[PDB]
């Protein structure tokens, strides 16, 4: 029963043509459920259950929060640029925070920020001070430590975040707890006197999965080239693992798939 509530913000100076410079998105158990950007200027549901369990007051307050964050992030982007003596170009501020209810019933919380891809400031694990990864973040820390910001975010992460995460897990229990089996497909192609075998798993949920290439009944280790778990458009996931062998030698290899939706691991073979 691992549950997570996460919010991430991105504030850019060079977003791209026709792209919002400020974007905030929220995830419950890895599933995107709320979204705000500087173009629509409104918090919007991204799942049916969050819209079906909230009133207009919720979205109005969230939209107010989002617009206030837009203004604050504009100013913070400018400040971070000037502490580096920077006048223009591609500069970005990133925020990532939230809370986790882990399987032992314990609580975890985090709130970290980044400037131009690298760490800038973060609330430390005791949630009592702010740690500045760069000197340019030391002024902010000072200000944030005289405004009682560490305790504010501690109270948010340890309470508000956790209770609203409990509400979200209630609202989306059927969706978050669902199981969708992967469609697996083994394929083979030969080139330069080498046989590349590939095993693709499509449309599985939840995200954790293991796809291994067995040779002669033994799990291969660093010989398999995996692509990681990548997203589908519909909230499911996809993965693919390849392995190189000799021209022929095809019956030696098997694909094994271990997932929460399969009571026993699936085994698949090539059929040319």
């Amino acid at each position: 029963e691992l549950h997570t509530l996460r919010y991430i913000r991105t504030a850019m100076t060079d977003p791209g043509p026709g792209q919002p410079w400020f974007v905030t998105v929220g995830y419950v158990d890895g599933e995107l459920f709320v979204h705000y950007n500087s173009t629509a200027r409104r918090y919007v549901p991204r799942t049916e259950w969050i819209a079906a369990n909230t009133d207009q007051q919720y979205w109005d307050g969230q939209t107010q929060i989002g617009q206030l964050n837009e203004q604050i992030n504009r100013e913070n982007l400018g400040i971070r640029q000037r502490r580096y003596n920077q006048t223009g170009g591609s500069h970005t501020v990133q925020w990532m925070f939230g809370c986790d209810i882990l399987e032992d019933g314990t609580i975890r919380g985090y709130r970290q920020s980044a400037y131009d891809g690298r760490d800038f400031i973060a609330l430390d694990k005791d949630m009592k001070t702010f740690t500045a990864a760069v000197p340019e973040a030391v002024p902010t820390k000072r200000k944030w430590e005289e405004e009682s910001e560490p305790e504010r975010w501690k109270n948010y992460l340890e309470e508000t975040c956790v209770e609203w995460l409990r509400r979200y897990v209630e609202y989306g229990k059927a969706e978050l707890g669902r199981r969708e089996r992967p469609e697996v497909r083994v394929w083979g192609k030969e080139a330069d006197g080498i046989l590349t075998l590939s095993c693709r798993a499509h449309g599985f949920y939840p995200r954790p999965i293991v796809v291994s290439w067995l040779k002669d009944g033994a799990v291969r280790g660093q010989d398999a080239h995996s692509g990681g778990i990548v997203p589908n458009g519909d909230g499911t996931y996809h993965t693919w693992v390849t392995i190189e062998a000799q021209p022929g030698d095809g019956d030696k290899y098997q694909c094994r798939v271990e997932h929460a939706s399969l009571p026993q691991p699936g085994l698949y073979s090539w059929k040319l």
């Binding site: 905030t24 964050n69 400040i79």
Partner: peptide, 8 residues
């Protein structure tokens, strides 16, 4: 729910 960031 989201919450507002602090001023830097």
């Amino acid at each position: 729910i989201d919450w507002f960031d602090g001023k830097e």
